[PDB]
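Hello,

I think I submitted the ruthenium ion job twice by accident. Can you confirm which output corresponds to this input? Input:
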Amino acid sequence: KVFGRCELAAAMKRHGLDNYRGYSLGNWVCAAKFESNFNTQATNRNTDGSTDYGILQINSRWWCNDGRTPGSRNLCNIPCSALLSSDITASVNCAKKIVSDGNGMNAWVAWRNRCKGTDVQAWIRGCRL
Ligand SMILES: [Cl-]
Ligand code: NA
Ligand SMILES: [Ru+3]
Ligand SMILES: [Ru+3]
Ligand SMILES: [Ru+3]
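Support: Only one job matched these inputs. Its output is below.
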């Protein structure tokens, strides 16, 4: 599924992300935009052989199992494919674990480089929430 901006903001809010670990809703929407262009089916292979999955580009090195990242972990205890669903529940619950892990949203490089410090509330501007 390719979510609309407001559609995603609403879904993220329903799933508990608004101010999770102190991150306003617009931070989450901005990160999804630059990670996946709001496409739940987004995948990207990293040069270390790991792969990033779904709307928040969650990496198989640490977070999910894809059976093809030797030496990896599966800290969210899910198949990586779960992260590509139209239902964002798996992505959201995994993202909670990630952002709780010590470096906050800096875990998402595209957040640090494109969202951090910016007017992130613009991402939720005009949405019914
Ligand atoms: Cl933090
Ligand atoms: Na893994
Ligand atoms: Ru939902
Ligand atoms: Ru950890
Ligand atoms: Ru870790």
